Amino acid sequence: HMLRLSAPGQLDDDLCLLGDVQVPVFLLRLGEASWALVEGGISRDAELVWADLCRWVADPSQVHYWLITHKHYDHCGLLPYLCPRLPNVQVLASERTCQAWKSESAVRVVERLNRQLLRAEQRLPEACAWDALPVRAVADGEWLELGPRHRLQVIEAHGHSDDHVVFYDVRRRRLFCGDALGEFDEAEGVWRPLVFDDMEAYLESLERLQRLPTLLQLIPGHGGLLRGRLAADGAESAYTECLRLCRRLLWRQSMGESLDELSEELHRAWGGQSVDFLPGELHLGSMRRMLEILSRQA
């Protein structure tokens, strides 16, 4: 498809995709001797993403920034394992995201879920402590002056999670939207909602993102880069699909169904796409959590 770029390697003049398209790390060329990373992946991909990075970046001390959308295990798992190899990097993340890395119980869940994705006999590299990460907290509305032609605005986009932010490059009409629009369905071309904290926040975030100047490139947390009408219509379409799922849930509950029937249907219909980075029971349980949130706020 011409509207979805979904291969490793160069995506635009300044932008490459590192690692696997299902849990990518994006590499921005900020200048002749300066780079940034966006999204923080899963821990087991450390040596893959490192190898890909080194194909493009001859001197990794030139990696100066690492932008992080949110605290989920699949968006920050690389940080302890590659930051020791990136001596000049500054991790840019929201206050709430930073705080999650200070919580011993929060760190435990991240580590447990990431270790469930290790291949047999696979060993992770030396790690620095989660609470020692070279982090600079960023605020809602903050302009990140990353390079002479790279200026990205932080936008709060809670609802998927209570810490989630997105990053908007208005020069390129390019939005790194993490999981705030949901999961893009590669077979059908629609958004699957991912509402795991707050439905009203999720929708309100999409309402605000729809007011941005028209997008040319929309880059979620999974599946690659979307362009053309998929980018221009993304926030609006994500909103619509979330309402569709709420109406579906209310229809079935009205027929006396338990949340478990639709949970299993959504796991059946939707769990295949993420099976290689979401450990066994986590997709089904995530679907149930989402439907619980939807049911309580509707």
Ligand X SMILES: Cc1ccsc1C(=O)O
Binding residues for Fe cation: 70, 72, 74-75, 160, 179, 222
What 3 state SS string does the chain have? Answer: CCCEECCCEEEECCEEEECCCCCCEEEEEEECCEEEEECCCCHHHHHHHHHHHHHHCCCHHHEEEEECCCCCCCCCCCHHHHHHHCCCCEEEEEHHHHHHCCCHHHHHHHHHHHHCCCCCCCCCCCCCCHHHCCEEEECCCCEEEEECCEEEEEEECCCCCCCCEEEEECCCCEEEEECCCCEECCCCCCEECCCCCCHHHHHHHHHHHHCCCCCCEEEECCCCEEECHHHHCHHHHHHHHHHHHHHHHHHHHHCCCCHHHHHHHHHHHHCCCCCCCCCCCHHHHHHHHHHHHHHHCC
The least distance separating Fe ion from the CB of residue 130, rounded to whole angstroms, comes to: 18
Among residues 72, 164, 174, 227, which is the contact residue for ligand X, using CB under 6 A?
72
| Residues engaged in binding Fe ion (CB under 5 A) | 72, 74, 179, 221
Does position 222 bind ligand X by CB under 6 A?
yes
The least distance separating Fe ion from the CB of residue 165, rounded to whole angstroms, comes to: 12
Among residues 239, 283, 291, 294, which is the contact residue for ligand X, using CB under 6 A?
283
Does position 278 bind ligand X by CB under 6 A?
yes
| Of 41-49, 56-64, 258-266, 278-286: span binding ligand X (CB under 6 A) | 278-286
Does position 183 bind ligand X by CB under 6 A?
yes
Question: Which is closer to ligand X, CB of 181 or CB of 278?
Answer: 278
The least distance separating Fe ion from the CB of residue 214, rounded to whole angstroms, comes to: 25
The least distance separating ligand X from the CB of residue 221, rounded to whole angstroms, comes to: 6
Does position 286 bind ligand X by CB under 6 A?
yes
Binding site for ligand X (CB under 6 A): 72, 74, 179, 183, 194, 221-222, 274, 278, 283, 286
